[PDB]
Amino acid sequence: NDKVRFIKDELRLLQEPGSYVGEVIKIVSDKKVLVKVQPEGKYIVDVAKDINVKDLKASQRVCLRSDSYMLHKVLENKADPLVSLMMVEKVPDSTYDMVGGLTKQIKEIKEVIELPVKHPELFESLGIAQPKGVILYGPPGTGKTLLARAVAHHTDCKFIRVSGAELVQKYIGEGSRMVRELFVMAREHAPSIIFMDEIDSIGSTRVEGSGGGDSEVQRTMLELLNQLDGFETSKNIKIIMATNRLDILDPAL
Amino acid sequence: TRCKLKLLRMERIKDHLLLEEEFVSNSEILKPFEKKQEEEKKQLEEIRGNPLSIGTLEEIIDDDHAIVTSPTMPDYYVSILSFVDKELLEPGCSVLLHHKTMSIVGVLQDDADPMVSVMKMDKSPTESYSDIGGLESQIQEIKESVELPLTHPELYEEMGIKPPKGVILYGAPGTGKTLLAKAVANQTSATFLRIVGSELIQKYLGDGPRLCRQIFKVAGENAPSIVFIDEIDAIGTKRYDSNSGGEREIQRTMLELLNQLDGFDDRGDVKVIMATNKIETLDPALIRPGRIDRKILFENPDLSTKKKILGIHTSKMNLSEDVNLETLVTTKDDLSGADIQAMCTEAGLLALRERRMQVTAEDFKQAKERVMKNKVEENLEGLYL
Amino acid sequence: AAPYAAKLKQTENDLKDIEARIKEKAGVKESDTGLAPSHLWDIMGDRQRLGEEHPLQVARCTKIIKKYVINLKQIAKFV
Amino acid sequence: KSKSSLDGKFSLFHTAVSVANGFMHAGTTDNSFIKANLPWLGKAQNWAKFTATASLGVIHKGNLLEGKKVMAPYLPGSRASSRFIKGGSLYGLGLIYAGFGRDTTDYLKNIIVENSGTSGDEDVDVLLHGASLGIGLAAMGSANIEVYEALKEVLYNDSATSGEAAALGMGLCMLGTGKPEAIHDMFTYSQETQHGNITRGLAVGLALINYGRQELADDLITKMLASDESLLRYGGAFTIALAYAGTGNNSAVKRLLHVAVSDSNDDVRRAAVIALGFVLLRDYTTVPRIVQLLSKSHNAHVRCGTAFALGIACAGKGLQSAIDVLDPLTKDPVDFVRQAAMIALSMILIQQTEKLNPQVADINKNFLSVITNKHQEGLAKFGACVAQGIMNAG
Amino acid sequence: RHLKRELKRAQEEVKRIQSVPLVIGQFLEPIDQNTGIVSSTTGMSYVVRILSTLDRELLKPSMSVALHRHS
Amino acid sequence: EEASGKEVEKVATAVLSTTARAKARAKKTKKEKGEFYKNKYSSKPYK
Amino acid sequence: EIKSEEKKGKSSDKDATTDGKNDDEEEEKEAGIVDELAYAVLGIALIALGEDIGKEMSLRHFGHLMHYGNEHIRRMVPLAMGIVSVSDPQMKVFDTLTRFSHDADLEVSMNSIFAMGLCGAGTNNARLA
Amino acid sequence: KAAVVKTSSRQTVFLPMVGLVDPDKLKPNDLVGVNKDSYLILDTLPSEF
Numbered sequence A: 001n002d003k004v005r006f007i008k009d010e011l012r013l014l015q016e017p018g019s020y021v022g023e024v025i026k027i028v029s030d031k032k033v034l035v036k037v038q039p040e041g042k043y044i045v046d047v048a049k050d051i052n053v054k055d056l057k058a059s060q061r062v063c064l065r066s067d068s069y070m071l072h073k074v075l076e077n078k079a080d081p082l083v084s085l086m087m088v089e090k091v092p093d094s095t096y097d098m099v100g101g102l103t104k105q106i107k108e109i110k111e112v113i114e115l116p117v118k119h120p121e122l123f124e125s126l127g128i129a130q131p132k133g134v135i136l137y138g139p140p141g142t143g144k145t146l147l148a149r150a151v152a153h154h155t156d157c158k159f160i161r162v163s164g165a166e167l168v169q170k171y172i173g174e175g176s177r178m179v180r181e182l183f184v185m186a187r188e189h190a191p192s193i194i195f196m197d198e199i200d201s202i203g204s205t206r207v208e209g210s211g212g213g214d215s216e217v218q219r220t221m222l223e224l225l226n227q228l229d230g231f232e233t234s235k236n237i238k239i240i241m242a243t244n245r246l247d248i249l250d251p252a253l
Numbered sequence B: 001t002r003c004k005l006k007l008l009r010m011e012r013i014k015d016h017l018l019l020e021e022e023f024v025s026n027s028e029i030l031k032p033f034e035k036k037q038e039e040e041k042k043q044l045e046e047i048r049g050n051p052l053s054i055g056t057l058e059e060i061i062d063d064d065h066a067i068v069t070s071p072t073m074p075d076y077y078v079s080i081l082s083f084v085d086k087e088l089l090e091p092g093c094s095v096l097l098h099h100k101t102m103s104i105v106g107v108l109q110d111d112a113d114p115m116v117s118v119m120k121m122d123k124s125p126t127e128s129y130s131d132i133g134g135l136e137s138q139i140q141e142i143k144e145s146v147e148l149p150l151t152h153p154e155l156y157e158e159m160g161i162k163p164p165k166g167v168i169l170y171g172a173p174g175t176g177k178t179l180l181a182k183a184v185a186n187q188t189s190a191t192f193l194r195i196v197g198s199e200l201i202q203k204y205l206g207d208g209p210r211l212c213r214q215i216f217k218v219a220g221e222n223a224p225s226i227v228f229i230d231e232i233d234a235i236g237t238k239r240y241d242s243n244s245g246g247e248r249e250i251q252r253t254m255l256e257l258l259n260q261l262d263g264f265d266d267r268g269d270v271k272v273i274m275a276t277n278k279i280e281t282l283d284p285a286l287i288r289p290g291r292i293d294r295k296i297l298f299e300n301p302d303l304s305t306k307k308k309i310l311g312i313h314t315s316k317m318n319l320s321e322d323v324n325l326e327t328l329v330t331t332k333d334d335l336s337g338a339d340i341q342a343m344c345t346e347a348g349l350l351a352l353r354e355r356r357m358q359v360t361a362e363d364f365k366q367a368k369e370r371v372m373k374n375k376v377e378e379n380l381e382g383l384y385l
Numbered sequence C: 001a002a003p004y005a006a007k008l009k010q011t012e013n014d015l016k017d018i019e020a021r022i023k024e025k026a027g028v029k030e031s032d033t034g035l036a037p038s039h040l041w042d043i044m045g046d047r048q049r050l051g052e053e054h055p056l057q058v059a060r061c062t063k064i065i066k067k068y069v070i071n072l073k074q075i076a077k078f079v
Numbered sequence D: 001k002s003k004s005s006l007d008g009k010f011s012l013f014h015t016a017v018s019v020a021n022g023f024m025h026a027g028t029t030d031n032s033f034i035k036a037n038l039p040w041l042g043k044a045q046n047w048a049k050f051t052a053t054a055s056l057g058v059i060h061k062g063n064l065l066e067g068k069k070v071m072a073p074y075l076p077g078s079r080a081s082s083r084f085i086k087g088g089s090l091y092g093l094g095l096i097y098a099g100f101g102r103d104t105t106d107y108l109k110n111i112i113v114e115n116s117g118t119s120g121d122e123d124v125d126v127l128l129h130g131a132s133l134g135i136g137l138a139a140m141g142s143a144n145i146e147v148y149e150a151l152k153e154v155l156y157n158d159s160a161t162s163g164e165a166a167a168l169g170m171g172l173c174m175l176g177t178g179k180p181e182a183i184h185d186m187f188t189y190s191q192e193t194q195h196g197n198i199t200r201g202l203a204v205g206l207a208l209i210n211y212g213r214q215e216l217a218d219d220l221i222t223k224m225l226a227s228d229e230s231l232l233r234y235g236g237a238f239t240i241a242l243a244y245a246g247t248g249n250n251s252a253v254k255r256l257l258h259v260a261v262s263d264s265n266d267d268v269r270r271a272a273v274i275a276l277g278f279v280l281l282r283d284y285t286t287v288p289r290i291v292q293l294l295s296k297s298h299n300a301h302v303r304c305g306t307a308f309a310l311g312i313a314c315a316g317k318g319l320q321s322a323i324d325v326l327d328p329l330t331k332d333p334v335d336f337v338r339q340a341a342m343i344a345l346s347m348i349l350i351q352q353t354e355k356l357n358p359q360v361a362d363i364n365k366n367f368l369s370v371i372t373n374k375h376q377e378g379l380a381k382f383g384a385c386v387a388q389g390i391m392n393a394g
Numbered sequence E: 001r002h003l004k005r006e007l008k009r010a011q012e013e014v015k016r017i018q019s020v021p022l023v024i025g026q027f028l029e030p031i032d033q034n035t036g037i038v039s040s041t042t043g044m045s046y047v048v049r050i051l052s053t054l055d056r057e058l059l060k061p062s063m064s065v066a067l068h069r070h071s
Numbered sequence F: 001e002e003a004s005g006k007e008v009e010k011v012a013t014a015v016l017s018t019t020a021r022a023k024a025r026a027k028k029t030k031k032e033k034g035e036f037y038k039n040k041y042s043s044k045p046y047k
Numbered sequence G: 001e002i003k004s005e006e007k008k009g010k011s012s013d014k015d016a017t018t019d020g021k022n023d024d025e026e027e028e029k030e031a032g033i034v035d036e037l038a039y040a041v042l043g044i045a046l047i048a049l050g051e052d053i054g055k056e057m058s059l060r061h062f063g064h065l066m067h068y069g070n071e072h073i074r075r076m077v078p079l080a081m082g083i084v085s086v087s088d089p090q091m092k093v094f095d096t097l098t099r100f101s102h103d104a105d106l107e108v109s110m111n112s113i114f115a116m117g118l119c120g121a122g123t124n125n126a127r128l129a
Numbered sequence H: 001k002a003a004v005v006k007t008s009s010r011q012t013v014f015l016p017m018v019g020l021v022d023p024d025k026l027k028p029n030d031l032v033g034v035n036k037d038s039y040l041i042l043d044t045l046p047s048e049f
C-alpha cells in the first residue's frame, strides 16, 4: 500500500516544468530580494512566504520556482564548479616517505606550509605576519607534484587541483572572470589548498609583451590576494603555484 | 582609559532604551500604517506584480515615455506609469519594471551592482598624513596641485592663472605610490572615490561605458572631490585575442572616460589622480596636458629616506632595538625601502628555522647578510669590461 | 574598572541585535515614490494600464523597398 | 467571529456562518443573530440570500405556534421583492414543521400545483426548488400519496434545479414504504434524464423510500449496482445502508466493501464508506480497525468518506479510537479532507465537558486557529465554522 | 490483490516519461542525496528531482546525463 | 471566547507587557539609586 | 483655541527631546558627544515611523543638535546629513545647520554653495524654499 | 524536391519544396520569404549584399 503511493508521488513531483537557482544579492524595504538568476539576468522577486527576510543573508544561494520564480528552499550546499573539482581530486593519501631523498626540500616544506594554517599565531610570533604564497620550480620528474600532495595529507585541508586556465570551463558565463572569481569560491570552501598549476607557456610573446588578455585575468586574481586580505589574516587558503621554470613565469609574480 | 569606559556606560542605556521605544512607537496604539499607507499600498500592488524585471534606463523623452533595455535583448518604447517623476529619475539608473507590461513602476535599485559598492567611500582614508616617513618633498608636490586649490582658490584667482588640475603618479614599484595618494587625500578630507580599473573592462558589450560615465557623474555631485583611478595601467594595450576583438569593447570604455573628463559640465573642481607604470603602456591619449598638469616621477628611496621607513619595521622585530638605528643603515648596502620589507621578512624567516624563541640582536644582524646575498645572486654577471 | 570592563563585552551583543532589527524597521512598507500629488496619478494609472499600446518593441529600417525590411535587435529579419 | 473574520459578500463564506449559527441558536427562536449581523446581512446575494431565509427556519425549529407567524412577511404574496426569499421561506417552514402537523402540508401542496407548468421564468425556478424540499419535510413519514403525485408533475416538467428537490421530496414524504409503483417510476425515469442533478436526486430518493425495507430491497440493489451509470451506482450504495441498518449484516457488509474495492469511480468509492457506518451504527467497536486501511487510500474522496463514516457511527458517546484515525486526516493537505475531519471530530465528543476530557480543549482551539489563518483555504475555514457550531449548538 | 494491479500500473506510467523523446544535459554535483543540480545543453541550470532507485555511485561525479524534456 | 474574543485578548496583553517594561524599568532603578480523569463523580450527594 | 492646547503639547515635547541631549553632551563629558550623535540618527527614524507630523519638528532641532553640542567633526557628517534633508520638508533645518558648518571655509563651504544651488535648480518646489 | 533554409530565427529547417515556387527560380543562396508559423518557402525576395 505504502509502496504504490511513493511511485505515484514521484510522478506527480516531476510534472512541474523548469525550476531554477539563483543567489540573493540584497534585501529591500518592501519585503522582496534581488536575485541573480544564475544563467539569466537579474530579477527582483519576493521571498517565499514561509521564510522571513531576517533568515536570509547576502550571497545566499537559493533555489527558485519557474512559474513565478518565487524562491523555493535555500541550497544546503553552494553551487560552484570548485566543489565538483575536489570530488574528483580526492583526499590525499600520499605521504613524505612515498618520495625518498631530496631530503632538504622535504624538511623545509613543512615549515613553509604546515604552520601558517595550524598555528597562524605561532608562525607570526617567532617570525612576522604570513607569506603571500609559494612558488615551486625545478627539474620535471623531481616529483614536485608528489611533494605538494604529501604535505597536504598531513595538513588535512581540501587539496583542490585547479589545473590550467578556467577558459576551459564554459558551464555558465564566460570562463574569463571565473579565474578571478576563484578567490570567492576558495573562501567559502575553506580549508583549501589551491594548487594553481599553470606553467605560463601560453606564449612567450605575451610574457615579454604588453599584449595578452590571459595576462590581464591572471593579474586581477593576484591583486585580490592583497586587497581583500581574506586569505592572509585568517590563513586557511594557501596559494600554492607551480611552474616548470622560474624564468617563463609572468613577471608580475 | 577612563574616557572609553564612559562611552560604554552611555551605550548600555542608549541601545536598551532604543529597542523598547521602537516597538511601542511604530505599532501598538499609534499603528504603523495609520491609514494613509494602506491607500498607497492597495494602488501599488495593482500596478505591480511579481516577478518584476530590473531594467537599465537609456534616455527619457518628456512625453511620459522612456527607452529601456531589460535582460532580454530588444529595447522597448515603454510608458512611464505613475510613481517616480521624470525629475526624480536619473538616466543611467537601474529601475523597476513590471513584467507583464513594462512600465516604470519606480526606482529603489540605484545601480545595485558590486562596482558601486567598491567605488563609494564617503569617509576619508585610513592613512593620515606623513605617518609615512621620507620622500617628504615628493609628497609636498602632490599637495601643491591637488589639495591647495580645493582648500583655497583665492591665491590662484589673484595670480590670474587657472588652478592646476590633475596629477599623474608614475615610476616604479616599491616607493609606495599608491599610499601617497591616500595620504594627500586624507588631509583635504575630500570625498575620495577609489576604483580598480580591471572592473571597468569586461567581455560583455556596452556595460563598460555605462559604468565609466557614472564615475564622472557621482564625482561632480560630491565636488570637492578626488577620483583615484588605480590600475589604469591594467587596461593598457592588452587585447583579448589578437585574431580580432579587443579593438571593439576596450576602445569604447577608454573613450567615455575622456569624453566626460572635461565633460559637458565644467569639472575643474574634480581632481584626478592616476597611478600607473607609464603612460606608454596605455595608448597615449590623456587629454588636456595642463588639465593633467604636473607629472610626478618617483625616485626610489635614498639613504636618508630608508632610515625612517626602517624604524617602523625594526619595532615589530622583538628586541632589535639593541642595534642602534644608525649603524643598521650604515653596514648594509644602499637599497630601496622595498628591500627593507624583504630584509625585515628575512629576520623572522631565520627566527622560524632556528626556533629562536625570542627575536634577538644576533638575528637582525644575520638577517642583513642573507638578504644582501640574495639580491647579488639573482643579478647576472655580464662583466663590466 | 572591572564593572565597566565587562560592559565592553555586553555592548557588542546589543549592536548585533540592532543590526537585524534594521530589517524590522523597513518592514513591508513602500519606500518608493507614489504619494503626495502623485497619489492622484495612480487612480488614472490603473485605466491606462489595461490599455495596450505599450510596451512596443523598438525596430529600425535597414532598407526601404518600394513595405520595409526591419532588422530587430535580436537579429531577426522581417518584411 | 462570523462578522469579523468571514466575509459576507463572498457567498461560500456566508453559507458557512449561516449554517453554524443556525444550529447555535437552534430549537428556540432567535432574532439576536439578525440584529447583530445586520450590515452583514445586506451584503448577501444570489444563493447566499436563499440560505439566509432558510437559516431562519433551522433557528426557529420548535415553538410551532410562532413558527408560521415569524415567516409571515417572507411568504409569497407578502414578498415578491426577491425570489430567493420567497422560495427559501417555504424550505424554512418545512424545517420547523418537520414531522409535526399536517395542517402545514396542505398549504404547500397548493403552491406546487400552481407552478407545475413552466419553471422557465427565472423567479419560478428558484421558488419551486424550496417548495419541493419544504413539503417533503413537512410530510415526513405521513405516506401521503397526494404529495407524491404533486412532485411527479415537477419532474416531468423537467424543471432545471427543482427537479432534484422534487425527487428528494418524494422519498422524505413516503419514507420507508417501499411502495413498488413509486420504485418502478423513479428508477426508469432516471435513465431518460440526461441532466445529472435530476438523476442524483432520484438515485438517492430510491434509497430513502426503501428505509428499513430489509431484504425486500434486494431487487433494487442488484439493478442499481449493475447500472452502467455512475450516478445510480452511487445511490445504489445508500440503498443497502438504509435498508440493512442497525444489526450488522454480513451480507450487507461484504457487499459494501466489495463495491468500494472494485468500482473505480471516485464518488462511488466514497458512497460505500459512509454507507458502512449506518449498518454498524450500534456496533462501532471494530469499525476503526476496518477503516484503518481506507485512510491510507491515495484517493482524496475515499479519505473524506472515511472521516464522515467514523463521525456517523460514534456520533453518540465518545470513543477514543476514532479520534486517532481522524488526527492525520485533519493535517492531510487536500482541503475537503481537512473539512471532513473537523466536522467528524465535534460529533463524536458532542457536548462532552472540557474539563472532563482534556482532548476536547485542544480540538476546539485548532478550529479557531484555522479561521485565523488566511493561508488555509476558503473551504477549510468553511469546515471550521460549521464544526464549532456543532460542538456548542442550541 | 487489488493494490497489486495499481502498483503495476503505477510503474507503467513512469516508463512513458522515462521513454523518448529525451534531451541531454550533464549532471553537475549533488545539493543533497536525492535532489541534485544539473546543467542542460541549453546552458540552463535546473535543480531537479532525482527519481527513486537510480544510479548514485557514479551519478555524483560530474557525468553526462538525460533529462525528460517536458518535466 | 471563540476566535473573536481571543484575538482581542491576545493583542491586548501584548501592548501592556511591552509598555510596562519600556518605562517601569528605567524609572524604578533610578528612583532608588539617587487529574482523576478516571475520578467519576465523588460518591457524595450533590443537589 | 481649544486647538492651541493640543498643538503646543506636541511641539514642545518634540523640542525637549532634542534639548536634553544637547544639555548633556555640551556640559558634561566629551565621550557622550559621540554617544548622542550615534543615537540621534536612529531616533529620527523612530519618530518618522510613529508620526508623519513628528518628523518635521524634529528635523529642525536635529541640525541644531550639531551647533549646540559642538561635535568633534564639522567636515564630513553635516554634509551627509544635509543631502538627506533636501528631500524632506523644511529648509529652516539648513539655517541652524550652517552655524556649525562654518569650519575652515572653502572645503565644507565649498561643498555648501555647490549643494544648495544645484537642488534649487533641480526642483523649484517653492520660492520660499 | 527539397530545400535547406537557414532562417533569420537562427534555426535550421529541412522543408518540402513548395511546388508552386519553381525549382528554376530558386537557386543556392537566394534570399526568400518564408511563412512565419509552418516553415515553407512562401515567396522570393530581391537579394541584399
Ligand SMILES: Nc1ncnc2c1ncn2[C@@H]1O[C@H](COP(=O)(O)OP(=O)(O)NP(=O)(O)O)[C@@H](O)[C@H]1O
Residues within 6 Å of the ligand: A099, A100, A138, A139, A140, A141, A142, A143, A144, A145, A146, A242, A243, A244
Ligand atoms: N623522486 C621520485 N621517485 C620516483 N619516481 C619519481 C620521482 N619523481 C618523479 N617520479 C616519476 O616521474 C614522473 C614524472 O614526474 P612528475 O610527476 O611529472 O613531476 P614534477 O617534477 O612535478 N613536474 P612538472 O610540473 O612537469 O615540472 C612521475 O609520474 C613519477 O612516475
Ligand SMILES: Nc1ncnc2c1ncn2[C@@H]1O[C@H](COP(=O)(O)OP(=O)(O)NP(=O)(O)O)[C@@H](O)[C@H]1O
Residues within 6 Å of the ligand: B132, B133, B134, B135, B172, B173, B174, B175, B176, B177, B178, B179, B301, B305, B309, B336, B337, B338, B340, B341
Ligand atoms: N615614502 C614611502 N611611502 C610609502 N612606502 C614607502 C616609502 N618609501 C618606501 N616605501 C616602502 O614601500 C613599501 C610599500 O610599497 P608597495 O605598496 O609595494 O608599492 P607601489 O609603488 O604602490 N606598487 P605596485 O606593487 O605596482 O602597486 C612600504 O611598505 C615601504 O617598505
Ligand SMILES: [Mg+2]
Residues within 6 Å of the ligand: A144, A145, A242
Ligand atoms: Mg608537477
Ligand SMILES: [Mg+2]
Residues within 6 Å of the ligand: B177, B178, B179
Ligand atoms: Mg600600488
